[PDB]
Design a protein around this ligand. Sequence first.
Ligand SMILES: NC(=O)c1sc(Nc2ccc(S(N)(=O)=O)cc2)nc1N
Length: 277
Amino acid sequence: MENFQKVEKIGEGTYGVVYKARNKLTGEVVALKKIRPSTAIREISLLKELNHPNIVKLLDVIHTENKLYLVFEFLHQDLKKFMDASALTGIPLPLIKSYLFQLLQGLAFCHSHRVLHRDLKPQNLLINTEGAIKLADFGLAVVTLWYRAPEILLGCKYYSTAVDIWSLGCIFAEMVTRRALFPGDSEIDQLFRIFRTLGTPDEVVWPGVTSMPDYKPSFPKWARQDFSKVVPPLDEDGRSLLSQMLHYDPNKRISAKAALAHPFFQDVTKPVPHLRL
Ligand SMILES: NC(=O)c1sc(Nc2ccc(S(N)(=O)=O)cc2)nc1N
């Protein structure tokens, strides 16, 4: 792209590299993703018409010389950087609530249009100075496993919208405690960290779990811990919501739409964050 003057590399995912760039003609600043099929582009072309206030806007899709570039509206900072910047004091609850609420709206929208994110993590949740937060880097049909739903880790071949609720629940907990909920460093360690905290799933809480591709009758049997210890600073409404976002059975896991009606959001507002850019 000679049409842009890459200002700096701002990120890197499994789908490619993203740069902060300036359109040397219009002068606009954007996020340019260099990716590297028709089912792909056709799939992407859907994403362009996927416009919502809590979804990073995909501006242009460019296919040239064996290269695929995606131009996105540029957002100020990602949630991982913001959480780190807020580690000494923690993000204030009203702001945590606002962000969670907006992200659920974004997911509710995606899911109603049959689009799944599949790889939600603090690094692809972007925020601006006006208090908004948006979903970025939608995943298409050293990697972080911390936000991966248990059914994915157990070999499910068909993801459901529930995997996004799980990831968001993990992010919610992390914003509240200032510590990753399940910081695994391998698929099995990830799986076992979830088990040690939520209890090893069985047929009672998760019908069908013992018949999953990577399930092993030999998994250790850990008892479930209390949420009071898992996310202590969270009030009971928040813990109630989190528990529903972290149900083992994808079918019992709360939907984005239902989560939006949870009492936790009765007093939701939209604070502005203190961003250091
Ligand atoms: N991937 C995307 O679509 C992106 S990434 C992005 N900007 C951005 C700005 C600052 C930071 S950081 N690490 O907090 O300084 C991270 C990301 N905007 C879009 N649309």
